[PDB]
Design an enzyme around this catalytic site. Structure first.
Site, PDB file in Angstrom:
ATOM      1  N   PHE E  36       0.788  -1.219   0.000  1.00  0.00           N
ATOM      2  CA  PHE E  36       0.000   0.000   0.000  1.00  0.00           C
ATOM      3  C   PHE E  36       0.826   1.277   0.000  1.00  0.00           C
ATOM      4  CE2 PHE E  36       0.277   1.551   4.365  1.00  0.00           C
ATOM      5  CZ  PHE E  36       0.736   0.443   5.035  1.00  0.00           C
ATOM      6  N   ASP E  37       1.985   1.310   0.648  1.00  0.00           N
ATOM      7  CA  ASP E  37       2.770   2.531   0.643  1.00  0.00           C
ATOM      8  C   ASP E  37       4.232   2.175   0.457  1.00  0.00           C
ATOM      9  OD1 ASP E  37       3.665   5.126   0.776  1.00  0.00           O
ATOM     10  OD2 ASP E  37       2.920   5.539   2.778  1.00  0.00           O
ATOM     11  N   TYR E  82      -4.502   1.864  12.236  1.00  0.00           N
ATOM     12  CA  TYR E  82      -5.685   2.706  12.068  1.00  0.00           C
ATOM     13  C   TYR E  82      -6.888   2.163  12.836  1.00  0.00           C
ATOM     14  CZ  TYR E  82      -3.073   5.151   8.495  1.00  0.00           C
ATOM     15  OH  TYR E  82      -2.130   5.886   7.821  1.00  0.00           O
TER      16      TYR E  82
END
Lengths: 331, 363, 138, 701, 107
Positions: E36-37, E82
Site C-alpha cells: 500500500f505505501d 488505524y
C-alpha cells in the site's frame, strides 16, 4: 434640481488632480487608453479574409457555412451566444461615372455570389427559424447577413430562399418572423420621461430600434423586384400546415408605432419647444415608421391584388388617420 | 385555451374540462370527427351537417347525456341524437345528402366554429386555478367561438398507438391479477403482447449513425415527440407496474404459453430503456422510483435490463443523482462482486460519480 | 478613504481583533479611535455603538470612519478648491468671475444652474462662499 | 500488462477501471487522490508512460490517471486565471520591453518575464502516516522535472520517428501515440513548467522558424489547436504586461505636466483664458481628466510617446497560424465539428488582434508593490470559490468568503472585484444552492459588496430581475434580516436615485404579486420593506416609482384600521405588517409638487391615499403613548404628516410616560431617543405640553 | 504490539532520542501480501519528529528501537494501526500491517 446641487458640491470637492498615489492614475490611464485609442480602423481585412478562404474537396468557407447550418439544424429550444457566429456573420456582412457604376453593381453581385453559392442563404433562413421568438444579438447578426446579401434586391438569392422554404417546409420560419415582430420595439410612453428625470438628477428609449430597421428591411428585400410568388407566399403560405399571414402582422406593428408616435405628440403638444432629446428620439422613431411604410409599398407594389385586398381589410386605416392627426398639427 | 380530459388515474376518465397553455401540445387534447355515413365519410365538413367527436387517447365519444351531464361513453352506448353536433359561424338555430368530397366549407386558421348540438340545441359554453369546465346551455356566452387546429399526421399515429397499447396492457394486467391471486381458465395474451412489444421497441428506435444530419435530426425530433407523449399519457408507470407483477415467479399460468415470460421481461426492460434514453424530462419524472430498480437489480436474471435502464437514467439527468444514496451504491458494488467483471457496472459507477459537469464529492 | 487610510483602519481593527471572526467587543470603540487619535464626546460614541448581538465588527465601522474623515475632507477641500482662484485671499469672488468659475467641466450645465447661483448668492459685487455653502450644501 | 494485448475482455475491464479511477478524482478531490497514490502508486505511472508496447487504451488510461491525479487541479486553477492579467508596478514590471531590443522581430513567446500574479501551486505529499490535515491538502505530489524531461524526450522521439510514417506506432494507430502524449504535454505546458531552455526546444520542435506540418488525424490536431491557442494567449500576456510597463513611465510625466500647468495657472499674472484652465483643472473626477488628456492627445511633447508606442503595438507565429488553419481546412475535408469550430476561432483570432486587446484591457489592473502577498492570498481564496462552482462543501465556501471579507485589497481596490467578476460567482453559487447558513452568508457577502462603492451597486443591479425570482426564501427566521435574496435586491437600490429610477414596473409587479400571495403573515412585511426602498431613496420620494407602487397596491392593499387595533392582545408580525404598510403608503406624494403646483396626478394619488386609512388613525397614535410602543406610532407619524392647521394639531396633545421614564430604564430607553427626531417635523394643553417639554429639558438638563 | 525482526542491523547503540527527527525509508505492505505505501517509490525519505506524536503508534514504537542504519520489520497489531475504523480508502477495517523500515539518520 436637487442632486445636481450635491454634484456641483462634489465637483469642487474632487480637488486632487494627480496626488493619486502612483497607480490609480495608471489605472485611469489604462481605462481611457482602452476607450479612446484602441477602437480604430482594422477593417481592410474582410474581403482579404474571404478571398483567402474561398480558394479550393470542399472549400473552407463552405466548411464554415455548413458548420453553422448544422448547428442551427439541431434541437436546443434556445440558441447559444456563439461569439464565433457573431464574429463571422459580421465579417460576411462587412465583405459585401456610369460604366464604373455598373462595375460597382457587378462586383457587389460577385461578392454575394461569393457567399450564396456556399449556402449562406440557407444558414440565415435557418438561424432565423431556429431562434423561436428571441430577439438576441444572434438574430441581429443573422438579419444583417440576410440584408448584406439581398442588398441590391438580388433575385438568385430570393429564388434560392423560396425554393428552400418550399422544400424543407418550414412553419418555423414564418412563426419565427411573427414572433420577432411581436416585440421588436415600441417607441415609448414614459421610459423617456423617467430617462429624462434620471439624467436631470444624477447628472435607452428605443433600446433596439436598429433591429427593427433590420427586420423590416429584410422583409422588404425578399419582395423587392416584384416577386409576385414571394409576395404571395408571405401571405397565403400554401404548402405548410398553419399559415402565418405576415402582412397583417406588419400592419399591426405599423399601428403600434403610430399610436406611440401620436402619444409622444400629445406629450409634446403643449410644451412647444422640442429639446435635443426629443429630436434625437423622435427622428429615431420616424425612421422606423418610414421603414415599415417602405415595406408595405414593397408588398403591394406589383399589383398582386390578393395582397391589396388582404391588407385593405386590416387595421391600416386607423394608422393612416393617426398619422394624419400627427402630420397636420406637427407640420 | 383548449379542450381537455383530465390526466391519468383520477372518474375512470369521463369528465370534460378546459385548459390552455401546455396541454395543447400533449396527447389528451385530441378529438376525431367521425360522421354518420360510412360511404364518402371523408367529404368536406360542412356547416350544419352532423358529426361526432371521439377521444383519441382513451377511445370514448362526446355523448351529451341530457339526463345527467356531458360525459364520455363507449361505442355500445352512444347514439345519434345524444352526440350529433353541428358547426356554424353564428350562434343561430336556423346539407345532408351529397357524394364526392363536396364543398370545401370550413377553414382551420380562419374559422369561428360554434358547436351546436342537434337534439337539445344546447351550446358548448364555459363556466367561471384554471380547470374551467365547459357546459351545455341554451343561450351561451359571447366567446364560445372555438377555432380549429388540426393535429399533424404523426401525432395522430402516436395517439392511436397510445390507446391500443393501454387497452392491451390493462387486459394483460387484469389477466395477471386474476391468475396471480388464485390458481387459474382465463385467457391472457402472450403472442399479441410479444408482437406488440417488439413493435414498440421498433417504434422508439434511435436514429442511425449512417445518415444525413438533416434527416437524423428530423428522426430524433420525432423520437422525442413520441417519448414525450408516452410520458404525458403515463406509459412508464404502466410498464413499470407490469414489470412488478411479472417479476414474482421464476419460470401458475399455462407453462407452454408461459414460457415466453423470459423474453417478455427482456423486452419490457429494453422498452423501459427506450422510453427514457433521450429525454431529461422523462427520466426526471422517473427519478422518484429509483430504489425500485436498484432493489430488483440483484435478481440475477434481468440485471442486464435493470442496469441499462439505470445507466440511461443516471446519465441524462442530474436530478436522479441526488436521490441515490449509500445503500443503493453499496448494492451496485455488491452486484459487481456477485456477477464477475462487467464493464457496464463500472460505467454505472462512472456516470453516478459525475453529472454533466458537476461532480459530487461525498458520492 | 485611501490606500493608506483603509490600510490603517484594517490594521487598527485587526490588531484590536483577537478571535479571528471580524468582530471586536463593544467597549473597544473609544480604544480604537484613540489608537487612531480620535477622542470625541461619549454621546457620539454611544450612537456609533448602537448603530452597530453586542459584537462591533468591520463594515459600518469602515463606513462611519469614512464619514468622520469626509467631514474634515469637506472643510479642507472646500477651502482649497476656492484657494485655487481668488488670488488676494478673502473668499470674496466677484459675480462675473463666479460665472467663470462655476461653468466647470464635469457638470457643465446651462444657464439654469448659474441662474440658480446669481438669483441668490448675496451680491453687493463681491460674494463670500459661505453663502454658497449654506445654499448648495442644503 | 504487456501480455494483456490479446486477452481482450480483461483489457476492456481494466480500461474501465482506469476510467473509474480517473473519473472519481474529478475536479479536485485530494482526499481521494492520495488513496489513488496508494493504489496506482507513482513510478508505476512513470513506467506506463514509457512502454512502447502497452495497448493504446491502457496508454490513454494511464495518461489520464497521471493528469487527473497530480496535475488537473492546478491546470484548471491556472486556466481560470489566464484571463485576468493583474500585475504589480515594481521595477521588475517596468523592465518589460515589448520587443526584443530594437529589431522588427517578435518575442518568440518563450519569455520568462511574465510579471503578473499567476497563482502559485502546492503539492502535498501522499504518505500514510500522521493525522496532519494533509489528506484534504492542496494535491498529491509528483516528480515534476523528471516528467518534464521525459515528455520532451518522448516528443522528440515520436516526431523524429512518426514523420518516417511507420506502420508500427505505439497504440497501433497514431492517435494513441500522440493524443495522450500531446494532452499531457499541454497540461504540463499550462502549469508554468518548461523554463526558457525547454520552451525554445519545444518551439524548435513545432515551429521550425515539423510537428505542425505532418499529416495528422482529427483529435491530434484538436489538441494541437488548443496548444496553439495557448501560445496566442502567452502572446497576449506579454503584450499587456508590456503596455503596463509603458503606462508606469507615461503617467508620471503626465502628472508632472499637469501639475506644472497647475503651477503656471495658479500664478495667473495677466488674466477668460485662465478660467477654462481652472475648468479643465477641476473636472468631475480623474476619469474625465484622463479622458480629456487623451482626447487632447487624440485630435505638446508627450504626444510623441503615445503616437510611437501605439505603432509599437502593431504587434511570425500569427502568420503561421493564419496560414496553416486555412491549409487544414483546404486539404482534408473535416468531420468532427468541434475541430472546425476550434479552427475558425483561431483563424478569426489571429486577424482580430486589436479586438482581443479590446476584450482584454478591461480585466488588467495594477497593484502597488506592498499589496502583492495579499492579492495572492485573496486570489487563492477566489480560486477556491471559483473551483467550488461545479459541485461539507459549504464550510469551504464559508471560510473562503469569510477570508475574502478580511483583506485590505477588497476595499483598496473596489474595481478589481468587478474585474474578477466575483459578485457574479458568489451569486451563481447561491443560485446553484437553490432549486441554510450557506445562503445566509452568500447574501450577507453580496449586501456587504453593494456598500463598498456606489458604482459597485450598479454592477449588482443588473441581476435584480433574477434576484427577485428567488425572493420567497425570506420568511420566519432570525437569519432573515440581512440574509434573504430579497434583502440583496433591496440593498442594491438603497442610496441611488439613478438606480431608483432605472427599475421597471414588472419587477414591482413581481413584488406585488408576492405580496398579494400573502392574503393571510410574517412574509408580507419583507416585501413591503423592499417597496419602501423602491419608492423613497433619499428623503424625497421619487414619484415614478411611487405612482406605480400605489397603483399596484390600490388594486388590493389587503375594518382593517381597527384590526391593527384588534391584535394588541395576541403576534407582533401583524402589528409590524400594518406599520410597514402604513409606512409604505406614507412614503409618497410630496408637497413641493402638490402645493407649489396643481400637478393633477399628485393630487389624485394623494386623494387615493386619503380614501384609505381615513384619519381615524389617532386612536392607533395615542393608545401607544402609555403602554411595540416605539415604532408603530412613528409609522403613523410618517403617514399623517406626509398625507394629511394647528387645531387638528392641538387635538392630538401624551409623551409624559416617556418623559417620566428618564430614570426607569429597557426599550423605553430607545423609544426616548426615537421620538427626539420624530416629533420635530410636527413643529410646523399648550401649557401642559410646554411643561412636559421643559421637564424633558430637565431630563435634557 | 510491535514485533520486530532485524532485516539488516545498524550498530544497535545509536538508537534515537526525543526531540529528534528520524529519516526513514518505509515500504509498508498489508498482511495479505499487497503493497500500500512505499517511501522508496516517490524517492522522498520520510521524516517525523518523535515526541510530537505525529505518526501511528506502532511506527513510533518501532522507530524507538532501530539504530543508525538498522533495517527492520514493524509488524503492527491492528489496534495499534488505524484500527476498527481503518484508513478510509487504503487500509480496510481491522487490517494488519507488515512494514519494512530502513532507519537512516537522526536530527
Amino acid at each position: 434640481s436637487k442632486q445636481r446641487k450635491r454634484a456641483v458640491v462634489a465637483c469642487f470637492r474632487m480637488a486632487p488632480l494627480y496626488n493619486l498615489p502612483r497607480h490609480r492614475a495608471v489605472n485611469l490611464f489604462l481605462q481611457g487608453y482602452e476607450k479612446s485609442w484602441i477602437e480604430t480602423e482594422e477593417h481592410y481585412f474582410e474581403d482579404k479574409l474571404i478571398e483567402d478562404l474561398a480558394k479550393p474537396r470542399v472549400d473552407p468557407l463552405h466548411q464554415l457555412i455548413l458548420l453553422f447550418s448544422r448547428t442551427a439544424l439541431t434541437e436546443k429550444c434556445k440558441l447559444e451566444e456563439d461569439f464565433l457566429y457573431m464574429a463571422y456573420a459580421d465579417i460576411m456582412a462587412k465583405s459585401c461615372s456610369f460604366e464604373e457604376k455598373e462595375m460597382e453593381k457587378q462586383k457587389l453581385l460577385y461578392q454575394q455570389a461569393r457567399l450564396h453559392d456556399r449556402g449562406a442563404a440557407e444558414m440565415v433562413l435557418q438561424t432565423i427559424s431556429a431562434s423561436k421568438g428571441e430577439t438576441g444579438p444572434m438574430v441581429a447578426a443573422t438579419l444583417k447577413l440576410g440584408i448584406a446579401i439581398l442588398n441590391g434586391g438580388n433575385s438568385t438569392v430570393q429564388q434560392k430562399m423560396l425554393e428552400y422554404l418550399k422544400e424543407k417546409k418550414d412553419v418555423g420560419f414564418f412563426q419565427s418572423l411573427a414572433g420577432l415582430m411581436q416585440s421588436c420595439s415600441v417607441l415609448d410612453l414614459n421610459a423617456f420621461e423617467r430617462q429624462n428625470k434620471a439624467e436631470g438628477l444624477g447628472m435607452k428609449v428605443l433600446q433596439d430600434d436598429e433591429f427593427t430597421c433590420d427586420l423590416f428591411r429584410f422583409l422588404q428585400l425578399l419582395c423587392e423586384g416584384h416577386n409576385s410568388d414571394f409576395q404571395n407566399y408571405l401571405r397565403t403560405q400554401t404548402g405548410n400546415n398553419t399559415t402565418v399571414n405576415i402582412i397583417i402582422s406588419t400592419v399591426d406593428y405599423l399601428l403600434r408605432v403610430q399610436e406611440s408616435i401620436s402619444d409622444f405628440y400629445w406629450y409634446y403638444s403643449g410644451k412647444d419647444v422640442i429639446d435635443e432629446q426629443g429630436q434625437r428620439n423622435f427622428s429615431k422613431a420616424i425612421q422606423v415608421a418610414k421603414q415599415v411604410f417602405n415595406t408595405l409599398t414593397e408588398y403591394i407594389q406589383g399589383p398582386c391584388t390578393g395582397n391589396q385586398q388582404s391588407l385593405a381589410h386590416s387595421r391600416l386605416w386607423d394608422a393612416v388617420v393617426g398619422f394624419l392627426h400627427v402630420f397636420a398639427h406637427m407640420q | 385555451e383548449c379542450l381537455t380530459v383530465p390526466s391519468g388515474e383520477h372518474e375512470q376518465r369521463r369528465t370534460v374540462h378546459y385548459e390552455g397553455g401546455a396541454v395543447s401540445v400533449h396527447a389528451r387534447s385530441l378529438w376525431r370527427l367521425e360522421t354518420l355515413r360510412v360511404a364518402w365519410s371523408g367529404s368536406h365538413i360542412r356547416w350544419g351537417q352532423p358529426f361526432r367527436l371521439r377521444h383519441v387517447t382513451t377511445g370514448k365519444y362526446l355523448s351529451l347525456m341530457e339526463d345527467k351531464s356531458l360525459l364520455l361513453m363507449d361505442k355500445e352506448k352512444a347514439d345519434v341524437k345524444s352526440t350529433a353536433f353541428t358547426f356554424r359561424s353564428s350562434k343561430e338555430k336556423l346539407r345532408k345528402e351529397v357524394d364526392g368530397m363536396g364543398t370545401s366549407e370550413i377553414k382551420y386558421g380562419d374559422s369561428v366554429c360554434f358547436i351546436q348540438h342537434i337534439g337539445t340545441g344546447l351550446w358548448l359554453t364555459y363556466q367561471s386555478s384554471i380547470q374551467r369546465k365547459a357546459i351545455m346551455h341554451h343561450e351561451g356566452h359571447m366567446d364560445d367561438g372555438l377555432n380549429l387546429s388540426r393535429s399533424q399526421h404523426e401525432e395522430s399515429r402516436t395517439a392511436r398507438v397510445i390507446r391500443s397499447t393501454v387497452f392491451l396492457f390493462n387486459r394483460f394486467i387484469r389477466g395477471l391479477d386474476a391468475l396471480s391471486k388464485k390458481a387459474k381458465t382465463v385467457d391472457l395474451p402472450i403472442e399479441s403482447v410479444s408482437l406488440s412489444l417488439q413493435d414498440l421497441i421498433g417504434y422508439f428506435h434511435p436514429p442511425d449513425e449512417h445518415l444525413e444530419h438533416e434527416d437524423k435530426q428530423n428522426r430524433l425530433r420525432a423520437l422525442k415527440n413520441r417519448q414525450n407523449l408516452f410520458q404525458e399519457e403515463g406509459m412508464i408507470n404502466l410498464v413499470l407496474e407490469c414489470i412488478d407483477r411479472l417479476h414474482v415467479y421464476s419460470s401458475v399460468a399455462g407453462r407452454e404459453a408461459g414460457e415466453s415470460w423470459k423474453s417478455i421481461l427482456n423486452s419490457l426492460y429494453e422498452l423501459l430503456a427506450a422510453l427514457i434514453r433521450g429525454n431529461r424530462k422523462n427520466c426526471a419524472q422517473f427519478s422518484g422510483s429509483l430504489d425500485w430498480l436498484i432493489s430488483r437489480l440483484e435478481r440475477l436474471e434481468a440485471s442486464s435490463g435493470i442496469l441499462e435502464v439505470l445507466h440511461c437514467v443516471l446519465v441524462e439527468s442530474p436530478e436522479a443523482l441526488n436521490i441515490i444514496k449509500e445503500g443503493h451504491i453499496k448494492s451496485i458494488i455488491s452486484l459487481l462482486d456477485k456477477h464477475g467483471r462487467n464493464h457496464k457496472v463500472l460505467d454505472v459507477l462512472c456516470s453516478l460519480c459525475v453529472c454533466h459537469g458537476v461532480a459530487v464529492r461525498s458520492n | 478613504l485611501t490606500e493608506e487610510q483603509i490600510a490603517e483602519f484594517k490594521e487598527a481593527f485587526s490588531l484590536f481583533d483577537k478571535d479571528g471572526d471580524g468582530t471586536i467587543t463593544t467597549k473597544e470603540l473609544g480604544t480604537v479611535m484613540r489608537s487612531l487619535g480620535q477622542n470625541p464626546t461619549e454621546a457620539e460614541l454611544q450612537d456609533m455603538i448602537n448603530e452597530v448581538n453586542g459584537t462591533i465588527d468591520f463594515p459600518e465601522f469602515l463606513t462611519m470612519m469614512a464619514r468622520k474623515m469626509k467631514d474634515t475632507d469637506s472643510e479642507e477641500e472646500i477651502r482649497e478648491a476656492f484657494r485655487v482662484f481668488d488670488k488676494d485671499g478673502n473668499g470674496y469672488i466677484s459675480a462675473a468671475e463666479l460665472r467663470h468659475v462655476m461653468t466647470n467641466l464635469g457638470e457643465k450645465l446651462t444657464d439654469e444652474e448659474v441662474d440658480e447661483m446669481i438669483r441668490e448668492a448675496d451680491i453687493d459685487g463681491q460674494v463670500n462662499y459661505e453663502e454658497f455653502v449654506q445654499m448648495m450644501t442644503a | 500488462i504487456l501480455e494483456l494485448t490479446e486477452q481482450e475482455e480483461l483489457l476492456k475491464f481494466h480500461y474501465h477501471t482506469l476510467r473509474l479511477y480517473s473519473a472519481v478524482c474529478a475536479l479536485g478531490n485530494h482526499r481521494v487522490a492520495h488513496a489513488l497514490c496508494s493504489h496506482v502508486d507513482e513510478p508505476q505511472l512513470l513506467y506506463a508512460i514509457e512502454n512502447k508496447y502497452m495497448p493504446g487504451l491502457l496508454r490513454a488510461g494511464y495518461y489520464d490517471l497521471l493528469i487527473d491525479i497530480h496535475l488537473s487541479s492546478y491546470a484548471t486553477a491556472r486556466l481560470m486565471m489566464n484571463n485576468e492579467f493583474i500585475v504589480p508596478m515594481t521595477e521588475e514590471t517596468k523592465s518589460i520591453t515589448l520587443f526584443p531590443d530594437e529589431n522588427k522581430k517578435h518575442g518568440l513567446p518563450g519569455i520568462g518575464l511574465s510579471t503578473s500574479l499567476r497563482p502559485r501551486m502546492q503539492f502535498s505529499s501522499p504518505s500514510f502516516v500522521s493525522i496532519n490535515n494533509e489528506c484534504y491538502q492542496y494535491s498529491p505530489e509528483f516528480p515534476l522535472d523528471i516528467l518534464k524531461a521525459k515528455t520532451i524526450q518522448m516528443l522528440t522521439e515520436a516526431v523524429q520517428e512518426g514523420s518516417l510514417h511507420a506502420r508500427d506506432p505505439v497504440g497501433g494507430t497514431t492517435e494513441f501515440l500522440f493524443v495522450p502524449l500531446i494532452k499531457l504535454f499541454y497540461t504540463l505546458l499550462i502549469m508554468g513548467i518548461f523554463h526558457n531552455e525547454d520552451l525554445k526546444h519545444i518551439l524548435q520542435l513545432i515551429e521550425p522558424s515539423g510537428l505542425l506540418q505532418m499529416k495528422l488525424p482529427e483529435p491530434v490536431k484538436l489538441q494541437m489547436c488548443l496548444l496553439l491557442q495557448y501560445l496566442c494567449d502567452c502572446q497576449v500576456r506579454h503584450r499587456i504586461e508590456a503596455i503596463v510597463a509603458f503606462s508606469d513611465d507615461f503617467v508620471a510625466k503626465l502628472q508632472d505636466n499637469q501639475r506644472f500647468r497647475y503651477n503656471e495657472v495658479m500664478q495667473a499674472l495677466n488674466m477668460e483664458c485662465p478660467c477654462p484652465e481652472e475648468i479643465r483643472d477641476q473636472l468631475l473626477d480623474f476619469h474625465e481628466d484622463l479622458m480629456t488628456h487623451c482626447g487632447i492627445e487624440l485630435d505638446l511633447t508627450i504626444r510623441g510617446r503615445l503616437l510611437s508606442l501605439v505603432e509599437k503595438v502593431t504587434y511570425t507565429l500569427q502568420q503561421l497560424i493564419s496560414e496553416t488553419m486555412v491549409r487544414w481546412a483546404q486539404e482534408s475535408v473535416i468531420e468532427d465539428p468541434e475541430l472546425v469550430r476550434a479552427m475558425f476561432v483561431l483563424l478569426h483570432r489571429q486577424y482580430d488582434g486589436i479586438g482581443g486587446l479590446v476584450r482584454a484591457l478591461p480585466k488588467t489592473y495594477t497593484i502597488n508593490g506592498v499589496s502583492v502577498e495579499d492579492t495572492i492570498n485573496l486570489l487563492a481564496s477566489l480560486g477556491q470559490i471559483r473551483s467550488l462552482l461545479s459541485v461539507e462543501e459549504e464550510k469551504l465556501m464559508i471560510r473562503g468568503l469569510g477570508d475574502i471579507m478580511n483583506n485590505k485589497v477588497f476595499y483598496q481596490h473596489p474595481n478589481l472585484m468587478r474585474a474578477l467578476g466575483m459578485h457574479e460567482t458568489v451569486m451563481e453559487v447561491m443560485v446553484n444552492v437553490l432549486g441554510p447558513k450557506m445562503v445566509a452568508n452568500c447574501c450577507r457577502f453580496l449586501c456587504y459588496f453593494c456598500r463598498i462603492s456606489r458604482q459597485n451597486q450598479k454592477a449588482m443591479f443588473d441581476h435584480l430581475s433574477y434576484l427577485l425570482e428567488n425572493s420567497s426564501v425570506g420568511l420566519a427566521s432570525p437569519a432573515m434580516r440581512g440574509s434573504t435574496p430579497l434583502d440583496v435586491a433591496a440593498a442594491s437600490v438603497m442610496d441611488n436615485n439613478e438606480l431608483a429610477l432605472a427599475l421597471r414596473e414588472p419587477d414591482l409587479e413581481k413584488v406585488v404579486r408576492y405580496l398579494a400571495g400573502c392574503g393571510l403573515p410574517v412574509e408580507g412585511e419583507r416585501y413591503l420593506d423592499f417597496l419602501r426602498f423602491a419608492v423613497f431613496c433619499n428623503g424625497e420620494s421619487v414619484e415614478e416609482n411611487a405612482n406605480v407602487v400605489v397603483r399596484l397596491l390600490i388594486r388590493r392593499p389587503e375594518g382593517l384600521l381597527a384590526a391593527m387595533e384588534e391584535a394588541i392582545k395576541i403576534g407582533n408580525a401583524i402589528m409590524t405588517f400594518y406599520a410597514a404598510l402604513i409606512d409604505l403608503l406614507g412614503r409618497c406624494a410630496p408637497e413641493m409638487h402638490l402645493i407649489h403646483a396643481a400637478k393633477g396626478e399628485a393630487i389624485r394619488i394623494r386623494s387615493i391615499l386619503r380614501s384609505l386609512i381615513p384619519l381615524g388613525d389617532l386612536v392607533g397614535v395615542i393608545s401607544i403613548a402609555f403602554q411595540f410602543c416605539p415604532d408603530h406610532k412613528a409609522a403613523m407619524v410618517l403617514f399623517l404628516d406626509r398625507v394629511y392647521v394647528q387645531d387638528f394639531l392641538l387635538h392630538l396633545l401624551g409623551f409624559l410616560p416617556d418623559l417620566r421614564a428618564a430614570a426607569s430604564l429597557t426599550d423605553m430607553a430607545l423609544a426616548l431617543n426615537r421620538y427626539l427626531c420624530t416629533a420635530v417635523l410636527p413643529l410646523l394643553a399648550g401649557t401642559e405640553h410646554h411643561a412636559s417639554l421643559i421637564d424633558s429639558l430637565l431630563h435634557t438638563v | 504490539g510491535v514485533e520486530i525482526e532485524t532485516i539488516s542491523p545498524g550498530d544497535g547503540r545509536t538508537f534515537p532520542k526525543k526531540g529528534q527527527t528520524c529519516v526513514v525509508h518505509y515500504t509498508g505492505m498489508l498482511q495479505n501480501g499487497k503493497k500500500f505505501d512505499s517511501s522508496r517509490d516517490r524517492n522522498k525519505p520520510f521524516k517525523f519528529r518523535i515526541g510530537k506524536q505525529e505518526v501511528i503508534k506502532g511506527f513510533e514504537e518501532g522507530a524507538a528501537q532501530m539504530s543508525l542504519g538498522q533495517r527492520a520489520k514493524l509488524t503492527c497489531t491492528p489496534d495499534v494501526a488505524y484500527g476498527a475504523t481503518g484508513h478510509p480508502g487504503v487500509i480496510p477495517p481491522n487490517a494488519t500491517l507488515i512494514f519494512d523500515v530502513e532507519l537512516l539518520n537522526l536530527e
